[PDB]
Design a protein around this ligand. Structure first.
Ligand SMILES: Cc1cn(C[C@H](N)C(=O)O)c(=O)n(Cc2c(C(=O)O)sc(Br)c2Br)c1=O
Ligand SMILES: Cc1cn(C[C@H](N)C(=O)O)c(=O)n(Cc2c(C(=O)O)sc(Br)c2Br)c1=O
Ligand SMILES: [Cl-]
Lengths: 251, 251
């Protein structure tokens, strides 16, 4: 069984290699998730074929119980594994299985260096600094559902003050932080990637929530627990650290 | 089936309640893990009986493949669940199963406030500040096995300079940080608990490794995945955050 692996283009997890050399199949790609997949394939001993998710989506539900993205590929048995920065969530565990996480993270704050601001509490109780997230993304969906005191007030500043708060994508959000007095809320992994590359920018405070990226499989897959074991081995032998360093470290 | 739950006395996860009131069975205990177990028991719908691990150990192997502690209780089918700050590790996954983690953590540094020291790199390349860990603990075992450049040099300062480096327990280590110019390396969860209560002390740098506490079960237990689902629900509805706050927050 050559395993079909669904994944998604996302810097620095999965990228097309910057090359016009004759590269075919898996060799067309590079990134943290390609390195991970190679290690997994060497520990477990499997052949694999990387296929980019056709709709370019992670995986969400509609009002009819219909899934899209990598999650749908798994449900439909069109992929054996999803090796991607795919968050392990309650709703997704209803329909697919996940390895234990290979990376753990949380929502955090992207902002400028040299400011008294040290937490989400500092942004919540002031008006001068504008703050928000990407529209219809994971971080927005968190703030919308939240019932925690401080994050409810923050969502009001994002929803009722809708205009100068939310952004279209990652690129525009970072643009807003640099050019204007703006703070972006997004997944801490993305924030670390940015701060390594933009020395005027820093993470503010700790993690607002807690979650992990795991390898997705169809429910009952005999690979899930084996992948957990491989992940634990890679963590303990310092290989996940080095793989993270390879892709995240800047100039 | 009234589930037998193995656990271990460890502040603030599991403690005897400070009361002479007539309290029996599970009611004798309090702590983060008791609160967690109650939530799990309400989501899954099980009855349970908390039993402290007789040997008071987490679970390690000897040179014959023989286990002790909570891990042994699970292997022997004398407990259905281990609900404790029990780290999910490669070696333990050989012999028991684990839910996905309810708490994630890493090795970090406990030291005084107001010092140029900002990482493990700062401690590694200097002699003036003494640093170590608890003898034969998780953090020591990490440094001993490590092949990462900076942590190998740090282990030399702990092993070859054995006398004024390692400590007997948590209590003595914190005592060393306060009284002498000493930095303690230990699990970040423990560090946060201490810094909330000792305003002269702070965490230094980020996390040196990455790992999680999970609920242990015997291999094949039908409760493992259900517990993962309950944990994800608790995380997403902010309950793990509030439970952490309940037990960790200081004066
Ligand atoms: C690597 C990565 C993956 N994902 C997808 C998410 N983990 C999922 O599984 O849906 C994200 O939402 N983020 C953060 C993010 C957003 C956010 O944090 O709100 S909005 C967008 Br577009 C992104 Br790409 C990531 O950085
Ligand atoms: C809550 C908790 C549990 N454990 C046990 C460990 N998680 C395991 O599963 O063995 C720890 O080692 N630590 C840190 C620790 C040590 C360390 O970090 O080296 S040494 C000792 Br005695 C402890 Br109690 C914890 O803080
Ligand atoms: Cl699992």
């Amino acid at each position: 069984r050559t395993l079909i692996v669904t994944t998604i283009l996302e810097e620095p997890y999965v990228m097309y290699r910057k090359s016009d050399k004759p590269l075919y199949g898996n060799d067309r790609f590079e990134g943290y998730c390609l390195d991970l997949l190679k290690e997994l394939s060497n520990i477990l001993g499997f052949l694999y074929d990387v296929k980019l998710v056709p709709d370019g989506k992670y995986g969400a539900q509609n009002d009819k119980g219909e899934w899209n993205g990598m999650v749908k590929e798994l449900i439909d048995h069109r992929a054996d594994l999803a090796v991607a920065p795919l968050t392990i969530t309650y709703v997704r565990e209803k329909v697919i299985d996940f390895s234990k996480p290979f990376m753990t993270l949380g929502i955090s704050i992207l902002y400028r260096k040299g400011t008294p601001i040290d937490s989400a509490d500092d942004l919540a109780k002031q008006t001068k600094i504008e703050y928000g997230a990407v529209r219809d993304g994971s971080t927005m969906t968190f703030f919308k559902k939240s019932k925690i005191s401080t994050y409810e007030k923050m969502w009001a500043f994002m929803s009722s003050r809708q205009q100068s708060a939310l952004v279209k994508n990652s690129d525009e959000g970072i643009q807003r932080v640099l050019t204007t007095d703006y703070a972006l809320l997004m997944e801490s992994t993305s924030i670390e990637y940015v701060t390594q590359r933009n020395c005027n920018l820093t993470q503010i405070g700790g993690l607002i929530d807690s979650k992990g990226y795991g390898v997705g499989t169809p429910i009952g897959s005999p690979y899930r627990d084996k992948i957990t074991i491989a992940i634990l081995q890679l963590q303990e032998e310092g290989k996940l650290h080095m793989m993270k360093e390879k892709w995240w470290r800047g100039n």
